[PDB]
Amino acid sequence: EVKLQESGGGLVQPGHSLRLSCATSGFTFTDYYMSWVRQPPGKALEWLGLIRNKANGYTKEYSASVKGRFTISRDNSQSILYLQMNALRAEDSATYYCVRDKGSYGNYEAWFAYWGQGTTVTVSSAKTTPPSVYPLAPGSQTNSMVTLGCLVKGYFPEPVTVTWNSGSLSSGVHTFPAVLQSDLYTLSSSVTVPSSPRPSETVTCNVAHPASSTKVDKKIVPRD
Amino acid sequence: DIELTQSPAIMAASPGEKVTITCSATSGVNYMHWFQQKPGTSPKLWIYSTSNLASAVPARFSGSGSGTSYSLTISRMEAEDAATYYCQQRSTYPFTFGGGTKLELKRADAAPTVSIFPPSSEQLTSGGASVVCFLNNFYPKDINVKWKIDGSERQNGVLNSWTDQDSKDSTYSMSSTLTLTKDEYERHNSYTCEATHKTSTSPIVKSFNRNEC
Numbered sequence: 397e398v399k400l401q402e403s404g405g406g407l408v409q410p411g412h413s414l415r416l417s418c419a420t421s422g423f424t425f426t427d428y429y430m431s432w433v434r435q436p437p438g439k440a441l442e443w444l445g446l447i448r449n450k451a452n453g454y455t456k457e458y459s460a461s462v463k464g465r466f467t468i469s470r471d472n473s474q475s476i477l478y479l480q481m482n483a484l485r486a487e488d489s490a491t492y493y494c495v496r497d498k499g500s501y502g503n504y505e506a507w508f509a510y511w512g513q514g515t516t517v518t519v520s521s522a523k524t525t526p527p528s529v530y531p532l533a534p535g536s537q538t539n540s541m542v543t544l545g546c547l548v549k550g551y552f553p554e555p556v557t558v559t560w561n562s563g564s565l566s567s568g569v570h571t572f573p574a575v576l577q578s579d580l581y582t583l584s585s586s587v588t589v590p591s592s593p594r595p596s597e598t599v600t601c602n603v604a605h606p607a608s609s610t611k612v613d614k615k616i617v618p619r620d
Numbered sequence: 621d622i623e624l625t626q627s628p629a630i631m632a633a634s635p636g637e638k639v640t641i642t643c644s645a646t647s648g649v650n651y652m653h654w655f656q657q658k659p660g661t662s663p664k665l666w667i668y669s670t671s672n673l674a675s676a677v678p679a680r681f682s683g684s685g686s687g688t689s690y691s692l693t694i695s696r697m698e699a700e701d702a703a704t705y706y707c708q709q710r711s712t713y714p715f716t717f718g719g720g721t722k723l724e725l726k727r728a729d730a731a732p733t734v735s736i737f738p739p740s741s742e743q744l745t746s747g748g749a750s751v752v753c754f755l756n757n758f759y760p761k762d763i764n765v766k767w768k769i770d771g772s773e774r775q776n777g778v779l780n781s782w783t784d785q786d787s788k789d790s791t792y793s794m795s796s797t798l799t800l801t802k803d804e805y806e807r808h809n810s811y812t813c814e815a816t817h818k819t820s821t822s823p824i825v826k827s828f829n830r831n832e833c
């Protein structure tokens with residue numbers, strides 16, 4: 397199974413460096429070219445460059461927006477694709493993607509067909525802040541479906557992750573995009589459940605903010 | 621340095637409707653590739669080499685063009701085709717993508733299921749107070765939220781978030797938050813979440829009253 401897995405993303409100060417990686421598996425790494433593409437929040441995809449296969453001497457190509465600052469490379473022993481980023485600017489903030497580029501054939505239908513899930517790079521001088529997780533429970537029942545939620549504020553940077561009852565509760569869920577304010581994010585997540593279960597059968601939101609190694613659980617208790 | 625411009629930037633289409641997106645290039649490229657990106661996931665290959673469909677793409681789709689003019693066409697719009705489309709040229713280094721077109725899907729009107737919540741005792745202890753209001757699963761998009769505290773409307777301290785068309789039911793959802801000081805919060809007494817949607821000339825509201833208990 398073709399597998400692309402990027403990592404390394406996180407918070408980095410302006411002017412500094414960050415090295416990202418992309419673990420591959422499910423195909424012969426050396427036979428393929430590989431590309432790095434990014435997408436800053438809410439904007440377009442951007443091709444940054446690529447590195448060719450071992451038939452092509454593993455040569456490299458770069459976008460003008462990062463040539464001289466970014467270096468691509470690979471570990472043909474472990475099948476890892478790398479992106480060396482030096483002197484990072486605000487514009488460098490985005491989700492980075494590795495893509496299996498061309499191969500030594502004519503399987504064009506597959507070129508750029510495989511992407512990784514992406515890794516969020518945030519270049520800012522702002523300081524990492526753990527989030528605060530609050531209960532969003534109703535006050536006053538004359539309804540069949542009851543909606544609850546969790547409030548995650550004052551954290552930095554993105555991304556946080558939210559799930560309910562460890563995830564067994566996957567339907568009727570809404571996690572709103574985060575809103576930035578004073579170098580601090582805030583987002584809420586709502587979950588809808590039939591009046592029957594909750595409060596009878598507990599409801600919990602699972603909040604994880606890897607950027608500040610924060611992991612909290614807030615059981616939502618009715619107001620009495 | 622071929623720059624690609626996509627149009628329209630945004631649009632909506634009813635089921636069965638024919639959709640057409642174009643992508644013009646400042647210079648001439650030999651092939652235009654296309655990508656479908658639904659929110660929160662990685663872009664997919666949707667059309668390669670101008671007119672070749674990618675793995676599993678429905679026949680209703682098709683692409684064409686040459687030189688500096690290209691287009692992706694959907695014969696009959698389906699609800700799943702809702703997403704953002706990206707053209708790309710790998711004709712000259714560096715490879716480039718276009719500005720993208722956000723294609724929305726239409727559907728039957730849906731009144732927003734609203735919910736309001738007072739700050740939690742937890743947050744209070746911090747000297748800060750936040751009232752949260754959810755306006756879930758509505759269609760159309762257009763929605764206006766207003767916070768009224770003891771009759772008087774409040775603007776300072778409100779921050780909103782809008783989700784992208786739900787991939788499961790094609791609706792939209794919004795979250796509104798009014799952050800005040802526990803100090804300011806403890807003065808006022810009534811907090812209302814007022815929403816105006818086309819699904820009612822009658823303003824939709826839900827509120828709560830700060831009760832000592």
Ligand SMILES: Cc1ncc(COP(=O)(O)O)c(CN[C@@H](CCCCN)C(=O)O)c1O
Binds near residue numbers: 712
């Ligand atoms: C994914 C990909 N990678 C690399 C290259 C160029 O390889 P090179 O740097 O070793 O020369 C191309 C060519 N893209 C052309 C031709 C591909 C069409 C195939 N039928 C285009 O996209 O117009 C490509 O599509």
